[PDB]
């Protein structure tokens, strides 16, 4: 993982979109290609449509979803089985 | 009979208060404790039954009654009359002294003990629990034994309801939860 001295990581355009949806108080799904951004505690309660390579799957943000990144909730390989 | 004296002096006064019974004979009381080991594997060998009865004879100092099959079932490959388990009925002072050694020694010797259930009172006050492993009693030597048995305890009391027995064991600080 990343060093603590660097802190977390998040895209600036994402942190501005979070700050906008916070101040506006709108619950629109934020579509986002930032699969590498760590979730912040101010992101709790938002639908964020994480890209997977092909489309945007919506992720409601939970308390437990704080210390992770957005890509963990957007699986990129679809596998059902061989038979 | 130490807990029997503690029953007779403080539990009856407590329950008469917390239920507002008309008579003192209306209070619950414990009647018997039954110690079963269902040994369905003794059809393989008698020695497993014969040694499981030896361990439980050490727990409660009575010779166990070897129980047999009431009828025959084929899913278990048993016939009517095979010795299939062992039981011990405990009454009186030997009941109270086992119940003291139980709630004082053996329940703390449970691995990962985290409480009992209050949902095991068979709708009519009679409590039933089952232990996974006989080594929680200190009567059994750990090197000397070879096979992990298990038994089940059935406390039969005179409480009509389920809560009057729950309050009775809680008056004996029985670790429900």
């Amino acid at each position: 993982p990343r060093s603590l001295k660097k802190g977390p990581f998040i895209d600036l355009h994402l942190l501005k979109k979070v700050e906008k949806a916070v101040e506006s108080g709108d619950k629109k799904p934020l579509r986002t290609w930032s699969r590498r951004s760590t979730i912040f505690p101010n992101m709790i309660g938002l639908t964020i449509a994480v890209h997977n390579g092909r489309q945007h799957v919506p992720v409601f943000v939970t308390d437990e979803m704080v210390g992770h990144k957005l890509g963990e909730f957007a699986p990129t390989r679809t596998y059902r089985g061989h038979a | 009979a130490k807990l029997h004296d503690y029953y007779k002096d403080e539990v009856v006064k407590k329950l008469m208060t917390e239920f507002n019974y008309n008579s003192v004979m209306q209070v619950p009381r414990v009647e018997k404790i039954t110690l079963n080991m269902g040994v369905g594997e003794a059809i393989a060998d008698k020695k497993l039954l014969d040694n499981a009865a030896a361990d439980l004879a050490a727990i409660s100092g009575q010779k166990p009654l070897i129980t047999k099959a009431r009828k025959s079932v084929a899913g278990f490959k048993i016939r009517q009359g095979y010795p299939i388990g062992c039981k011990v009925t405990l009454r009186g002072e030997r009941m109270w002294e086992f119940f003291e050694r139980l709630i004082t020694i053996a329940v703390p010797r449970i691995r990962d003990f985290r409480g009992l259930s209050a949902k095991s009172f068979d709708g009519r006050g009679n409590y039933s629990m089952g232990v996974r492993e006989q080594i929680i009693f200190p009567e059994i030597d750990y090197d000397k034994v070879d096979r992990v048995r298990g038994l089940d305890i059935t406390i039969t009391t005179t409480a009509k309801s389920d809560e009057e027995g729950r309050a009775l064991l809680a008056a004996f600080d029985f670790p429900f939860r």
Binding site: E64, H68, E72, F73, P75 | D112, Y142
Partner: protein
Amino acid sequence: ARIAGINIPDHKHAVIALTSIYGVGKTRSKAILAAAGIAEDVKISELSEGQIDTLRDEVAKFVVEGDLRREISMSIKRLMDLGCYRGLRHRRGLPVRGQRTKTNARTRKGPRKPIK
């Protein structure tokens, strides 16, 4: 010879029979015996019961069998309930850490499953 719920073999040494505890290893067993002042070359035999009580207090300083198994199951079911990639790997039975599943995933996948 009975620490933290379970029994402990007497013929082995101190650090090893302590390492029989689910939650300690040779490191933490050295930290236990160093905090109890007990030499490592002694057995669980020829120990004072006061030394074993000091040992029980030192083991009680850490997280062990029932607590540790509860915490491990809580972390796994936290990933299960989140539905992250690690949760999906934990419930598909597949390796979590990014290993290969084309070949050599036999620890998580068990023995071979023949094509029928």
